RNA sequence: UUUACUUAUUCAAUGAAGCGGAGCUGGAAUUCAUUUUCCACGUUCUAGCAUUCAAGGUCCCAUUCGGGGCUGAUCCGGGUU
């Protein structure tokens, strides 16, 4: 205050030097963000297929929450635990002399691509969650429609790695769950009909489902401008 | 097999709202069939009639009226002030020998990005007890005259387009203004706009559009 | 030119060491003129927007 | 046969451009924020001739909006522009002679130089000593200004499109005979040597399409379809016309 | 048999700086009852000066010897043109 006297500044046009503005929009990019971000881009571009099309359409956040809640204490044996495996029917097979059913058999989460899909086959599977990643899009595009012409539940989710994380992997794709527990039996029940109505009759509309043909904010505004302001005022 | 007479519809043209009877003839253009049709293609039609057909007056005959096409809405198109010709005889009657004729050139906008050209063509007549069948003029007559119909006009048509313009060009405002100004010394009949188009539009805007409709 | 002295070499003046003071005297005028002639070009633009 | 001049020469060796002395090229400001907006104040550095062109060049320095800096930008010669001449840029900075700024932004007849079917080329046509271009039509629908050019050509731009009001400084430059080809060899020392030319009728069959006959001749006529082979190009490439010129080409 | 939008294909351009839309203010047709809408958005006497999170406006500092954003300069959305 006591010495405290300003004066003006123009920036407007043609005069003054322009600061710290926010080039985050037209900033020099390198060809491997030019490609994985307009991937995803020249995907929304086109029609999406009726086989696909429900890449990008999937589960609500709340359901699959829950999908997820009991799953993390069905996490397999890893390293240190799996080897506390082999110490078990050592001082039992031995000290003891066991007959191999000294420890009880597998109850935790399923993992395994080639194996989930052969559980569907032979339908042994009590459960089945489907992933919509993968980069080959052509490569694991049979998960929903097997589980649809064999009966087997399928409810496609955002996050493939926690699949394979709470069960030693890195990635997984397919979490199944043939078993349950002496008390978490409630939760096979409910989820087999809230993941029934979720998708697996949906697909009797979603038959003829095509997606994409949306272009950027730019031919979107200006498409409302030529074809909106052509009738609508 | 041609046969393309099946495939021309027929379109109905209405009049502006600066005029009466909107209701002016049935003529013909084209239905699509072959592929092909009449819509948001070409429009670059116009309109040829005179106003005294297009309203009801016998002593006062003159001055054909020039539209443009604007918008269709289910086999009723309208159109709006995009000119104003003339006939031969309507100039080549009035311009006869021994008299003095004048041509006034002047340009005008309005404020909805709009443009037009308008002019006036003056002549002279005579006085009480005349005896000589001729006279000329003086030069520092016509110089006069010609600086003061610009002065009116450019200032009475900007703001509401062809609204306003056409709202002191059928009254007769303008000839009758200059005729008892210049009264004063030498007066001059006649004197009218003769031949005035636009030529320069907006664009499109359904907004702009609809404050000037009927 | 580096291996003298300020008091030897250019001088202790503005711009003693880049034009030639000359050019340079027609330079203050025209610029200390314009900057004058900038707030009272500046302040009448103040005034042709408030009565309105 | 052998091997022609013009078909050697499009290989490229020494038939490049005689700079190194010269100043610069032919590059004025792209169009940005406020060049397609408002303008600027600009300022002439001087009107320096270019070493190995005809009419000299306006290196009009630009006052950097990004901090103080001041790079030196060229434009054209503009006839008559002083030292020191505020030449303003801008869609926005009036119609004044050497200013610049969008052909659809100003009126027609208006007559500028180095136009650009894009604006921010910072440089294409009307850039020759003495002419100039003349704007025949404004169709503010999809931005389309119709501009003339020395021949007489109708390429309809953009209303955006860069364009300098004036002619390029050298007028009669070609109206005035040289006498002495010595000054003419004097000018190519700067360009390239398109120059000396001599007759094909004059070098033997091998050297040149026309060659032979030891009584001097073409042979076959000199009239050549507009898209001959690249050993038969020599002569009259589609002469719809030939003899009392009327300046016609494509069509006129 | 016809024209549309763009993402493939393709041009030109920069050290991807000004994009689509809309909006803060004002002006410009005036309202069928109120926002029914179109344009600009610090730089035009003159071979000048323009640059350190700009200064200000405001709050936390645990007060200091010094510092930080927000707006200033609209904001929303990532499609450099």
Same mark, same amino acid.
Request: contains cysteine; positive net charge.
């Given at each position: ?74 996490? +397999? ?27 009880? &058999?597998?109850?935790?989460?399923? =993992? ?43 409810? !496609? ?77 | *097999? ?13 009049? /502006? ?27 670059? #039609? ?97 110089? %006069? !005259? ?40 030498? +007066? ?27 | ?17 880049? #034009?030639?003071?000359?050019?340079? &005297? ?16 500046? *302040?009448? $633009? ?7 | 046969?052998? *091997? ?39 300022? *002439? ?28 930008? !060229? ?26 700024? /969008?052909?659809?932004?100003? /009126?027609?007849?208006? !007559? ?11 440089? %294409? ?18 931005? $389309? ?41 004097? $000018? =190519? ?43 038969? &190009? ?6 719809? #016309? ?11």
């Amino acid at each position: 205050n006591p010495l405290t006297h300003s004066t003006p500044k123009n920036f407007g046009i043609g005069q003054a030097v322009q600061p710290k503005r926010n080039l985050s929009r037209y900033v020099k990019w390198p060809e491997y963000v030019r490609v994985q971000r307009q991937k995803k881009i020249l995907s929304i571009r086109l029609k999406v297929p009726p086989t696909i099309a429900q890449f990008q359409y999937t589960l609500d956040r709340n359901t699959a929450a829950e999908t997820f809640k009991l799953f993390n204490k069905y996490r +397999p044996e890893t390293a240190a635990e799996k080897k506390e495996r082999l110490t078990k029917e050592a001082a039992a097979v031995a000290e003891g002399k066991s007959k191999q059913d000294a420890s009880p &058999k597998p109850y935790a989460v399923k =993992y395994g691509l080639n194996h989930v899909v052969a559980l569907i086959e032979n339908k042994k599977a009590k459960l089945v969650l489907i992933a919509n990643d993968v980069d080959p899009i052509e490569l694991v595009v049979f998960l929903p429609a097997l589980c649809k012409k064999m009966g087997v539940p399928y409810a !496609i989710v955002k996050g493939k790695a926690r699949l394979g994380t709470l069960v030693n992997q890195k990635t997984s794709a397919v979490a199944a769950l043939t078993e349950v527990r002496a008390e978490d039996e409630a939760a096979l029940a409910k989820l087999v009909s809230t993941i029934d109505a979720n998708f697996a009759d949906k697909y009797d509309e979603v038959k003829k489902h095509w997606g994409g043909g949306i272009l950027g904010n730019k031919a979107q505004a200006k498409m409302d401008k030529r074809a909106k302001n052509s009738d609508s005022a | *097999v041609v046969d393309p007479f099946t495939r021309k519809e027929w379109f109905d043209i209405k009049a /502006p709202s600066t005029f009466e009877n909107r209701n002016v003839g049935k003529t013909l253009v084209n239905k699509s069939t072959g592929l092909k049709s009449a819509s948001d293609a070409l429009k670059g #039609r116009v309109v040829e009639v005179c106003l005294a057909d297009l309203q009801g007056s016998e002593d006062h005959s003159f001055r054909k009226i020039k539209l443009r096409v604007d918008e269709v809405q289910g086999k009723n198109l309208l159109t709006n002030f995009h000119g104003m010709d003339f006939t031969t005889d309507k100039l080549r009657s009035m311009v006869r020998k021994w008299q003095t004729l004048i041509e006034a050139n002047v340009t005008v906008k309005t404020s909805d990005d709009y443009v037009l050209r308008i002019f006036a063509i003056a002549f002279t007549r005579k006085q009480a007890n005349q005896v000589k069948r001729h006279s000329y003029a003086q030069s520092s007559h016509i110089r %006069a !005259i010609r600086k003061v119909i610009s002065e009116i006009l450019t200032k009475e048509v900007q703001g509401s387009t062809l609204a306003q313009l056409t709202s002191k060009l059928i009254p007769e405002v303008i000839n009758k203004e200059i005729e008892n100004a210049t009264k004063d010394i030498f +007066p001059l009949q006649n004197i009218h706009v003769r031949k005035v188009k636009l030529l320069k539009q907006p664009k499109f805007d359904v907004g702009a559009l609809m404050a000037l409709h009927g | 030119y580096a291996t003298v002295s300020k008091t030897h070499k250019t001088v202790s003046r503005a711009y003693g060491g880049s #034009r030639c003071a000359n050019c340079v &005297k027609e330079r203050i005028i025209r610029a200390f003129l314009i900057e004058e002639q900038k707030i009272v070009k500046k *302040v009448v $633009k103040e005034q042709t927007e408030a009565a309105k | 046969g052998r *091997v022609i001049r013009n078909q050697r020469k499009g290989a490229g060796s020494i038939f490049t451009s005689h700079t190194r002395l010269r100043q610069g090229a032919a590059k004025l400001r792209t169009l940005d924020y406020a060049e397609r907006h408002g303008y600027i104040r600009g300022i *002439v550095k001087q009107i320096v001739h270019d070493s190995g062109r005809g009419a000299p060049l306006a290196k009009v320095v630009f006052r950097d909006p990004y901090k103080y800096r001041l790079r030196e930008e !060229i434009f054209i010669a503009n006839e008559g522009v002083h030292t020191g001449q505020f030449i303003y840029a801008g869609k926005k900075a009036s119609l004044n002679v050497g200013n610049v700024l /969008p052909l659809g932004s100003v /009126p027609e007849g208006t !007559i500028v130089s180095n136009v650009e079917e894009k604006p921010g080329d910072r440089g %294409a046509l009307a850039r020759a000593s003495g002419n100039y271009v003349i704007i025949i039509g404004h169709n503010p629908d999809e931005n $389309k200004t119709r501009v003339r050019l020395p021949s007489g050509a109708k390429k309809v731009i953009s209303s955006d499109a860069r364009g300098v009001i004036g002619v390029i400084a050298g007028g009669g430059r070609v109206d005035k005979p040289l006498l002495k080809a010595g000054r003419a060899f004097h $000018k =190519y020392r700067l360009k390239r040597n398109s120059w000396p030319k001599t007759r094909g009728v004059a070098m033997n069959p091998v050297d040149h399409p026309h060659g032979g006959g030891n009584h001097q001749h073409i042979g076959k006529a000199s009239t050549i379809s507009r898209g001959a082979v690249s050993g038969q &190009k020599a002569g009259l490439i589609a002469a719809r #016309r030939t003899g009392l010129l009327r300046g016609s080409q494509k069509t006129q």
